[PDB]
Structure 1
Amino acid sequence: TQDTQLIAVDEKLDITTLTGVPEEHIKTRKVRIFVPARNNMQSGVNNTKKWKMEFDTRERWENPLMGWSSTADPLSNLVLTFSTKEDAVAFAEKNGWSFDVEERKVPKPKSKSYGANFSWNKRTRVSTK
């Protein structure tokens, strides 16, 4: 499409050689690819429509001077939104992170009927509205 000496490279993409992630943080860290759960105390579902990749939690010790939440894992507060799952995971191997994939939990379709609240025989008659 370009006539620019298109070599047919086959080896899977690995840019971990260049991103500069230190040796500890590239192999040991395990990332999790999941759809965020709907915050149960709310009711809206806008926050559960984008795949997100986050890293495992590490030590959180209190600073001696004043009680803090000091940590020493730079990859702690780093989440990344992703449209679809295969695109999210494609980032993981490309950056060589041992990934763990969940599946998109979605509400199963329910059947609601206001007429059921007042039935003649069925034991679904609501006691008070």
Structure 2
Amino acid sequence: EEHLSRKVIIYSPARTATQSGSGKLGKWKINFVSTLKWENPLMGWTSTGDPYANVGDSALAFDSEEAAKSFAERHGWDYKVKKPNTPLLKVKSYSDNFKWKGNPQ
């Protein structure tokens, strides 16, 4: 009812820039944009009242773009799809390091 009209983002998380390994891609997430948190005035702990605080990152997951879209539409959420960026493999040669500079101009 109340939590079924929130709008979500369906996306496939990119690769971390701090590591060269590509083993965390291919997954599709549903982002609930839970951005209502504050500090508890006793210990400084981070508080929330939003039930979808971490379920979008901890438990819910999808192996395909279609599966995430189907799940969102069955529950009635308004979704926007962000297509992932992919690298373009280009021709690289080690011999390029020693390319001739040509005749002196």
Please give the TM-score of this superposition, normalised by the length of structure 1. Answer: 0.71
Aligned to 2:101: 121
On the 8 A contact 2:10/2:30 being kept in 1, the answer is yes
User: Kindly, what percent of the aligned residue pairs are identical?
Assistant: 48
1:37 maps to 14
CA offsets, 1:19-57, max 9 Å, x none? xxxx33111x22111111111111111111211112112
**Which structure 2 segments of 5+ residues have no match?**
none
Residue aligning to 1:5? none
C-alpha distance in structure 2 between counterparts of 1:77 and 1:31, whole Å: 13
Q: Partners of 1:25 and 1:58 in 2: how far apart?
A: 15
Cα distance in 1 for partners of 2:51, 2:75 equals 16
1:60–1:70 CA contact under 8 A, matched in 2: yes
Residue 50 (structure 2) aligned to one of 73, 76, 80: 73
- Structure 1: segments with no counterpart, 5+ residues: 1-22, 123-129
Question: Aligned partners of 1:44 and 1:30: how far apart in 2?
Answer: 32
Structure 1 residue ranges (4+ consecutive) displaced by more than 6 angstroms after TM superposition: none
**Cα-Cα RMSD:** 1.4
Asked if the contact 2:27/2:64 (under 8 Å) is kept, the reply is yes
Q: State the number of aligned residues.
A: 99
Greater Rg over alpha carbons, structure: 1
TM-fit CA distance, 1:71: 0.3
**1:24, 1:65 → 2: CA distance?**
31
Alignment check: 8 A CA contact 1:58 1:71 kept: no
How do 1:18-97 residues align onto structure 2 when only pairs under 5 Å count? 23-27=1-5, 29-79=6-56, 80-97=60-77
Alignment partners' CA distance in 2, 1:76 and 1:83 = 22
2:13–2:84 CA contact under 8 A, matched in 1: no
Higher strand share: 2
TM-score in terms of structure 2 length? 0.86
1:10 is matched with: none
